[PDB]
Amino acid sequence: LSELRDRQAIFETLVAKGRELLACDRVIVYAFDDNYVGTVVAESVAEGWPQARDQVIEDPCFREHWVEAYRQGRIQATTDIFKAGLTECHLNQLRPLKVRANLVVPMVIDDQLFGLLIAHQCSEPRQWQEIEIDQFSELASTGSLVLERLHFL
Amino acid sequence: DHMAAVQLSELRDRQAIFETLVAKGRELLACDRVIVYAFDDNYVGTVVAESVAEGWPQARDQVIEDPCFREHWVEAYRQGRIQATTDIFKAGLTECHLNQLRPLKVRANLVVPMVIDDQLFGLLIAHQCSEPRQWQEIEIDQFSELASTGSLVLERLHFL
Ligand SMILES: *[C@@H](C)C1=C(C)C(=O)N[C@H]1Cc1[nH]c(/C=C2N=C(/C=C3/NC(=O)C(CC)=C3C)C(C)=C\2CCC(=O)O)c(CCC(=O)O)c1C
Ligand SMILES: *[C@@H](C)C1=C(C)C(=O)N[C@H]1Cc1[nH]c(/C=C2N=C(/C=C3/NC(=O)C(CC)=C3C)C(C)=C\2CCC(=O)O)c(CCC(=O)O)c1C
Numbered sequence A: 001l002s003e004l005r006d007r008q009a010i011f012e013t014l015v016a017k018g019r020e021l022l023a024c025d026r027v028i029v030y031a032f033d034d035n036y037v038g039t040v041v042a043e044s045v046a047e048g049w050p051q052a053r054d055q056v057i058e059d060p061c062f063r064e065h066w067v068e069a070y071r072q073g074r075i076q077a078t079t080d081i082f083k084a085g086l087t088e089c090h091l092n093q094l095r096p097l098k099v100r101a102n103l104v105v106p107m108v109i110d111d112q113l114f115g116l117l118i119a120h121q122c123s124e125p126r127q128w129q130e131i132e133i134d135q136f137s138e139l140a141s142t143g144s145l146v147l148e149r150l151h152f153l
Numbered sequence B: 001d002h003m004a005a006v007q008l009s010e011l012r013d014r015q016a017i018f019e020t021l022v023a024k025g026r027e028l029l030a031c032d033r034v035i036v037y038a039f040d041d042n043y044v045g046t047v048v049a050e051s052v053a054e055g056w057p058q059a060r061d062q063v064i065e066d067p068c069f070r071e072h073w074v075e076a077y078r079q080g081r082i083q084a085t086t087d088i089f090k091a092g093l094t095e096c097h098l099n100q101l102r103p104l105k106v107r108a109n110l111v112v113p114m115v116i117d118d119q120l121f122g123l124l125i126a127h128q129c130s131e132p133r134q135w136q137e138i139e140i141d142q143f144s145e146l147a148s149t150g151s152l153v154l155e156r157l158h159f160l
Helices: A007-022 A065-071 A088-097 A130-152 B014-029 B073-078 B095-104 B137-159
Strands: A026-032 A038-045 A076-078 A101-109 A112-121 B033-039 B045-052 B083-085 B108-116 B119-128
Touching: A007 A026, A007 A038, A007 A112, A007 A130, A038 A112, A065 A101, A065 A112, A101 A130, A112 A130, A130 B137, B014 B033, B014 B045, B014 B119, B014 B137, B045 B119, B073 B108, B073 B119, B108 B137, B119 B137
Parallel strands: none
Antiparallel strands: A026 A038, A026 A112, A076 A101, A101 A112, B033 B045, B033 B119, B083 B108, B108 B119
């Protein structure tokens, strides 16, 4: 990882390592351009589960305020999205992907947010453990160090 | 939930990087000691940080002999070598090398390089002192990932 000098290779590594790390159903990188508008840029998904790129998922074309919360280091660890008080529109974004559990960590260095590293469990609800959250978020941070290095180099 | 209050990836000071490497490494492995042996610009290495379990000797409390020049064994680590030694008294080490570790009461010895693109920042080292100990593949991978993360942050300091 530390040696990668290509954006897409980094994103695909993160996504493979993340799913391996958590043994969950899907890991995704939702990456931000300069306007903090985001797109799904990579996905690792267990066989048989829906792939993001096969769906049309609505996503408002502006930077919503949760972007700033992640930028400051918010982590979302949701055991079951149907019990978490999500908006209907948000549930509708995750429904096609058959999400139950939702773990969202920032890929951020010095308050520059490169993206979000996201895990889903689809088969059933899943309580994310502290040590999984720590390891997944260290993976995000390492990926972020190498994304940032791209600019320097 | 929230990212940790201090992150290795957010450190912007050399010595802080070494001290968090050594704290996190000893917690990861639950071993007796973790050190960083860091290289200066002339490839001279120095123990710059240590985290050690209660009751075991501290590196800085000892006089450990160490040839003033860069030895040949350094190149193997620059190139990515890892040494994982279950019991240093049964590993065919030289007497002089044994005498560097005796004062620290080392039995097991794990050595991973802190290296990016052929720049060797140091070695991250773990000791078990209480008993011999066979380092597991999972431990070696995790310890080595920590070392590489530390190396990314040392490198960044140059750029910054
Ligand atoms: C519904 C289209 C929409 C309206 C209208 C609105 O104003 N905002 C939403 C619902 C909404 N969504 C989130 C959080 C996220 N939205 C994401 C967008 C995506 N685009 C995709 O292609 C995709 C498939 C993986 C998604 C999920 C993302 C990445 C997030 C953050 C991750 C997550 O929380 O799922 C919110 C904020 C929820 C909260 O934190 O309060 C809202 C209101
Ligand atoms: C003994 C003074 C000496 C002579 C003479 C010589 O030519 N080389 C040695 C013995 C020797 N040491 C190593 C490898 C290491 N030596 C280290 C130096 C240290 N300085 C310290 O303060 C200290 C306390 C922690 C140490 C251990 C270190 C860090 C190493 C690498 C890590 C390890 O292997 O313990 C060698 C090379 C042996 C090999 O790997 O083939 C030799 C011959």
